[PDB]
């Protein structure tokens, strides 16, 4: 009722079904500063010791 | 040649040993300790990979 005689349509589609709630979960790799941190003031060389 | 040719080993003696029994009969105070922080960095001028 809100289109014409002329139809406009989409042949092709994309969705992604799931049948358990278990694959709903994925997986991301991270740093781990505990054991490897960021670093911070690279090396220098010594003068000014004080 | 006598005995007043011995008056200066015998004040050494007496000065040993008026330190010695002086120190022996002190008190001695624990003194607390104060003053401990990382305050002994060093410094210099970076690296600075060029690139």
Same mark, same amino acid.
């Given at each position: 009722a809100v289109?014409?005689? @002329?139809? @406009?349509?989409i042949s092709?589609?994309?969705?992604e079904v799931l049948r358990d709630l278990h694959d709903l979960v994925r997986s991301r790799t991270y740093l781990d500063v505990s054991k490897s941190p960021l670093a911070?003031?690279?090396?220098?060389? @010594?003068?000014y010791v004080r | 040649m006598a005995s007043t040719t011995r008056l200066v080993n015998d004040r050494k003696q007496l000065?040993?040993?008026v330190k010695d029994?002086?120190?022996?009969?002190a008190d001695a105070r624990g003194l607390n300790i104060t003053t401990v922080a990382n305050d002994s960095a060093t410094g210099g001028q970076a690296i600075r990979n060029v690139g």
């Open positions: 289109e014409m005689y @002329v139809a @406009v349509r092709r589609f994309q969705l911070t003031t690279p090396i220098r060389v @010594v003068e | 000065e040993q040993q029994d002086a120190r022996i009969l």
